[PDB]
Amino acid sequence: MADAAVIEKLEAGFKKLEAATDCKSLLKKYLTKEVFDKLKDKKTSLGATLLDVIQSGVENLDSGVGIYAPDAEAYTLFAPLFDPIIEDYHVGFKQTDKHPNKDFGDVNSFVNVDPEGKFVISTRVRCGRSMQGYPFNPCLTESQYKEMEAKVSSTLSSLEGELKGTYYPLTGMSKEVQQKLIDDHFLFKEGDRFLQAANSCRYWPAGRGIYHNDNKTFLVWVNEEDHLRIISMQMGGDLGQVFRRLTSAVNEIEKRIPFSHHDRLGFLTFCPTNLGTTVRASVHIKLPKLAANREKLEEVAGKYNLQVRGTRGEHTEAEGGIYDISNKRRMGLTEFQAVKEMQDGILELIKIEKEM
Ligand SMILES: Nc1ncnc2c1ncn2[C@@H]1O[C@H](COP(=O)(O)OP(=O)(O)O)[C@@H](O)[C@H]1O
Numbered sequence: 467m468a469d470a471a472v473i474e475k476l477e478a479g480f481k482k483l484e485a486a487t488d489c490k491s492l493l494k495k496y497l498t499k500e501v502f503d504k505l506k507d508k509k510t511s512l513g514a515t516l517l518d519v520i521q522s523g524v525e526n527l528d529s530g531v532g533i534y535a536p537d538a539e540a541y542t543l544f545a546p547l548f549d550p551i552i553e554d555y556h557v558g559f560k561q562t563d564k565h566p567n568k569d570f571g572d573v574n575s576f577v578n579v580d581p582e583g584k585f586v587i588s589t590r591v592r593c594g595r596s597m598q599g600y601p602f603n604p605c606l607t608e609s610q611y612k613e614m615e616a617k618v619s620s621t622l623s624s625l626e627g628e629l630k631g632t633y634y635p636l637t638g639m640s641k642e643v644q645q646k647l648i649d650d651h652f653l654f655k656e657g658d659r660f661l662q663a664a665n666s667c668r669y670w671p672a673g674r675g676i677y678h679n680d681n682k683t684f685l686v687w688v689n690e691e692d693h694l695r696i697i698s699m700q701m702g703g704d705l706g707q708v709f710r711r712l713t714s715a716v717n718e719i720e721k722r723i724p725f726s727h728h729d730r731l732g733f734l735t736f737c738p739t740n741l742g743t744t745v746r747a748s749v750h751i752k753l754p755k756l757a758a759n760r761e762k763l764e765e766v767a768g769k770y771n772l773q774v775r776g777t778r779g780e781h782t783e784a785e786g787g788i789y790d791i792s793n794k795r796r797m798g799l800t801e802f803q804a805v806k807e808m809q810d811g812i813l814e815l816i817k818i819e820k821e822m
């Protein structure tokens with residue numbers, strides 16, 4: 467499997483992880499010497515090694531998780547490492563558990579979490595999808611990036627109603643518009659250090675782009691972290707409308723683009739945090755009393771299985787006291803359950819804010 471160069475780097479990375487006293491990644495926690503010795507010589511059919519799985523967490527010691535799947539096979543070949551990390555992250559998703567069958571459920575039941583708008587600025591739900599027949603970022607070729615982009619853009623051009631829109635490739639995109647789309651919370655960052663270290667930004671920006679409707683309430687990211695991110699968002703608190711629109715989009719898109727699903731893992735994605743439902747439902751929310759210390763808010767949010775991010779996304783700070791709060795877990799519960807877990811948590815945090 468792994469050649470001499472890769473093995474040398476692996477031994478060094480394992481030592482670096484062990485030596486990192488301030489590291490608390492799931493990677494460091496679960497890559498025991500035993501698991502390491504068991505996996506270090508392995509290599510997938512596409513040639514992905516344990517290095518291709520763990521390098522981002524070796525380079526970024528402050529990672530929360532620290533691993534990615536370079537191909538679909540990696541989830542299985544390196545299951546002794548993925549499985550306990552997946553169980554830890556998704557709370558209660560055990561080594562022999564299977565993620566439930568897709569179910570958006572009772573979309574109608576979701577509420578406006580803040581009609582007046584004293585707390586919630588905007589509401590967003592995204593899913594991730596991988597295209598059948600293509601591996602994840604570290605194993606994609608330039609030809610594949612462009613080929614996937616051509617499929618996606620030509621496909622989405624047939625979408626109608628609220629889903630009708632336009633594909634905007636990053637290649638040739640106005641620099642001014644690109645930064646404004648990022649600042650306005652619509653377009654992905656041009657990578658980050660976690661993705662860079664995973665060899666996840668190769669050939670940038672070939673094959674990368676964003677589809678969106680004119681009012682930017684429905685968007686599709688092409689070839690960022692995942693092949694597709696399918697996104698519904700709007701100002702205000704109407705989680706019901708947001709999720710209704712996302713569900714319609716997902717249903718229409720899969721009629722046109724075959725997606726990778728796994729009997730145990732659900733829908734496949736590049737990071738193990740995004741498997742299963744792949745759902746991240748979030749609000750941009752102001753909670754001035756509760757969020758005086760980010761730590762106290764994080765404690766309280768954690769009790770409801772919520773995750774706190776900054777205004778520009780993960781690894782950013784809250785600007786003007788606007789926090790991104792979302793369901794943390796995505797596996798071992800249905801799409802409906804994931805959004806309901808977010809909704810129930812947000813309502814609880816608003817009650818807490820009001821009462822303290
Ligand atoms: N409720 C929300 N309203 C507006 N923008 C949001 C919301 N949630 C996330 N975002 C935006 O999503 C973008 C991606 O952030 P990130 O943390 O990388 O999440 P993901 O990749 O899961 O979409 C950022 O531009 C961020 O500002």
Ligand SMILES: NC(=[NH2+])NCCC[C@H](N)C(=O)O
Nearest residue numbers: 529530531532533660737739
């Ligand atoms: N975009 C994501 N997949 N975020 C979750 C993992 C991010 C990064 N690899 C870490 O371990 O902290």
Ligand SMILES: [Mg+2]
Nearest residue numbers: 654691779780
């Ligand atoms: Mg992201």
